[PDB]
Amino acid sequence: YDLTECSFKNEAGETYDLSSLSRYSDNWEAVTGTGSTEHYLINVCKSLSPQAGSDPCPPEAAVCLLGGPKPVNLGRVRDSPQWSQGLTLLKYVDGDLCPDQIRKKSTTIRFTCSESHVNSRPMFISAVEDCEYTFSWPTAAACAVKSNVHDDCQVTNPATGHLFDLSSLSGRAGFTAAYSEKGLVYLSVCGDNENCANGVGACFGQTRISVGKASKRLTYVDQVLQLVYEGGSPCPSKTGLSYKSVISFVCRPEVGPTNRPMLISLDKRTCTLFFSWHTPLACEQTTECSVRNGSSLIDLSPLIHRTGGYEAYDESEDDGSDTSPDFYINICQPLNPMHGLACPAGTAVCKVPVDGPPIDIGRVAGPPILNPIANEVYLNFESSTPCLADRHFNYTSLITFHCKRGVSMGTPKLLRTSVCDFVFEWETPLVCPDEVKTDGCSSLSKSTFKVTRGPHTYSVGVCTAAAGLDEGGCKDGAVCLLSGSKGASFGRLASMKLDYRHQDEAVILSYANGDTCPPETEDGEPCVFPFVFNGKSYEECVVESRARLWCATTANYDRDHEWGFCKHSTSHRTSVIIFKCDEDADVGRPQVFSEVRGCEVTFEWKTKVVCPPKKMECKFVQKHRTYDLRLLSSLTGSWSFVHNGASYYINLCQKIYKGPQDCSERASVCKKSTSGEVQVLGLVHTQKLDVVDDRVIVTYSKGHYCGDNKTASAVIELTCAKTVGRPSFTRFDVDSCTYHFSWDSRAACMVNGTITNPANGRSFSLGDIYFKRFSASGDVRTNGDRYIYEIQLSSITGSSSPACSGASICQRKANDQHFSRKVGTSNQTRYYVQDGDLDVVFTSSSKCGKDKTKSVSSTIFFHCDPLVKDGIPEFSHETADCQYLFSWHTSAVCPLGA
Secondary structure: OOOOOOEEEOOOOOEEEOHHHOOOOOOEEOEOOOOOOOEEEEOOOOOOOOOOOOOOOOOOOOEEEEOOOOOEEEEEEOOOOEEEOOEEEEEEEOOOOOOOOOOOOEEEEEEOOOOOOOOOOOEEEEEEOOOEEEEEEOOOOOOEOOOEEEOOOEEOOOOOOOOEEOHHHOOOOOEEEEOOOOOEEEEOOOOOOOOOOOOOOOOEOOOOOOOOOOOOOEEEOOOOEEEOOOOOOOOOOOOOOOOEEEEEEEEOOOOOOOOOOOOOEEEOOOOEEEEOOEEOOOOOOOOOOEEEEOOEEEEOHHHOOOOOOEEOOOEOOOOOOOOOOOEEEOOOOOOOOEOOEOOOOOOOEEEOOOOOOOEEOOEEOOOOEEOOOOOOEEEEEEOOOOOOOOOOOOOEEEEEEEEOOOOOOOOOEEOEOOOOEEEEEEEEOOOOOOOOOOOOOOOOOOOOEEEEOOOOEEEEOOOOOOOOOOOOOOOOEEEEEEOOOOOOOOEEOOOOOOOEEOOOOEEEEEEOOOOEOOOOOOOOOOOOOOEEEOOEEEOOOEOOOOOOOEEEOOOEOOOOOOEEEOOOOOOEOEEEEEEEEOOOOOOOOOOEEEEOOOOEEEEEOOEOOOOOOOOOOOEEEOOOOEEEOOOOOOOOOOOOOOOOOOOOEOOOOOOOOOOOOOOOOOOOOEEEOOOOOEEEOOOOOOOOEEEEOOEEEEOOOOOOOOOOOOOOOOOEOOEEOOOOEEEEEEEEOOOOOOEEEEEEEOOOOOOOOOOEEOOOOEEOOOOOOOOOOOOOOOOEEEOOOOOOEEEOOOOOOOOOOOOOOOEEEOOOOOOOOOOOOOOEEOOOEEOOEOOOOEEEEEOOOOOOOOOOOOOOOOEEEEOOOOOOOOOOOOOOEEEOOOEEEEEEOOOOOOOOOO
16 A cells, blocks of 8 residues: 555645544444445555454455455556546555456546545445445545634544634643753643743743743644744754744643653744643544444434534432433544533543532443443543542443434433432434345336437336336346447346445435446456447447457547457346435435446435334433423324314324325425415424423424515423323414414323322323243343343242342352342332332332441332333443442333323
8 A cells, every 4th residue: 555645636726635534443343235245345545454353365455345256456556636527535555456357457436525424434335246336434534624723722623523622721830841851842732831930831930031922812623733932032053943832732642641742853943832632632532332233333423413412311219300411422433512501622521510510420431332241332431530439540431332223313311310320321323233035115106207418318117117118138138228229138126126224314225137237348458338430329339350350449430540349248237226215305306426347327316205204202301400392292193272263183292194285294384375375384394392481392384485585483381290281372473483382282391010100190001011820930140251140020928049038139140059249129219200110119128338227219110112022131330349230121111191
């Protein structure tokens, strides 16, 4: 890899830095189609990082294909990445030669500027077997590298938006960078210096030669912060010039984090002091957020918020108003602050209670780790600011990842808030193992399309026959070519009906085995058809004035005379139609994404008809109150409560299914103008959720243009009461087309026997798991440490293995006559009622540990998921080895939740 610069210059006077994705430890695994036995370990500007696993890729491979047979070199790094055809292309050549047996395998990366997800992986688009691979990489490091200057220590990155704050080095004591011991430079950043005069940035302070004249004008270029300190002392050797101390701030991992500013060079020729610095502050973090379990890459990358973090919920049996801003979580980067939020540098998980200092309860320890026993992934967060007990130099925070299928990525929830460890559980569909199968399509087979890019007009259609009548060439072809020669079948209709991939929010759909793609070459160069030769438009190879069937390598011989003998392989035409989601049009227009040899068509079909509901998440928590409105969530149809001639159908936590016709039903709330056109309120993305003064801010913008610059966005009020409250239609402003509406909701604000929760004075069904007639059906086991634990639920009977006295939970290392543990004793047990969970607990039965006398409260949680159909639990984590916590997903748990 003769060093290729990972940056280039555009024709329109822009520059692009893709070096923010050169990974050296653990190279990028491509996002392939769901149900692939092939894996693509690629690396952007470097020949692959040693993937010491069993036989790796050849040492000079930059892009490489794993899975089934040997790793095949897909190409090494030839040149720097180029701007070509409107995208950012990066070309690898010199792979392990294909069935063509002339060309070595090549790969093109298509980088695209996107601030959508923080760690975006190179996605898999086209698999043509003839030496060509195309990866779409919709990263954030593919945007133009612009310089942002700000008037304090807080400066932004205009490309990505990651914060840059040297306010953690804002102290007038300063820092002693050292050259060769004649002078020791007392320099300070973002403030004044200790060992020198008023308003000084840097000096060697035995004589106090002030170089700095300090200000907070922090500028920034492509992951390099720099402070500018001009207007210093004059120069003894040369012309009166000003002394200046401009300090560079690079990123580094944690090896000696806050060490010396370390003067690297001093200019006596032109009177400059060049200070380095190696920070964890100037860094959009090099913390890889992927785990490797054999074949699959179980990843947490798209769970990272770009403009802050996650409003979580604390679980504690209490009487309080529940501390509404109490937690803010990030996964594999620190937080980004906001109005009413300030907690210090490298805070991964923050905590902001009432009368709240900035307490950091977590920082990123390392990559996410899976328990190989169960199906859940953990992340553990150590800290520097210590526990209220000072035995440890940290507040510890752990997050548990259980599978919860659907499309709602969800909010993290904190469980029972323990002594010195905050153990959160986040239910995401991203943990669930990948399984979609080939059944649905229907709604986009009603029309065929003939879209062109260049001389050739590709005639495509999904789930039906494309061009049979137009040319007569392809009767079975779902994707065909209209050049006027014939229907060139790019793939059979029943050959493939390919299905979803996750992080693109797109459905890849391919066809193949239709017709032999043009492979005609003697030197690798393919021949483009029809060429005009001897005044003849030749659609195939021709024996004219030469020995073998031979082709011209241009769309004309007679002008260029660029030729060679044909050698046709057994390679076939292959189509790809990628169903990217967009809000633009129901029926999108699929344009040609890419093209190679005329052997591959690719279609970015920007549809609205095949991509998920993507309903508003209605768990927000703010201003000393919790809010979860899943009882107003109306699944099929909606409420109708507007008079004076209008069909009101409101969606919260939802879209509208079974709405009134001649409207945008799917989008949002719609209302009738009687015997005319029907009026929508707003769209799928526009549902803002905050609250002011016992009135939730719930609105629907960008629908019903009453004019073209201002539209109908209805501010609705909602208060909580004991009873279900009947709705009422409120007035509206004509000035701003802002409607109002009234609503009242409930949830806007001894376990022995069958379960009874007197919230409305109602009992429920526990007897399917309570085990009153089952002897040893509750004995479960999950691996915690070398010391294996064991749980039985709420049936005081049997005493199968231990001498454990009158307890439900007896945690045994498969030890039978020994006193295994005496933890889950059933002398007295209680629980309390939360809106989406319950906390069944014990109290004060059997002591352990350091004898605080109140450390016996083992907690079990039962989620509101009737989908499991049978209960196999895990154990979550320990509380000082005597009161524990673990979760259990069960079918018959949750009442009064719609």
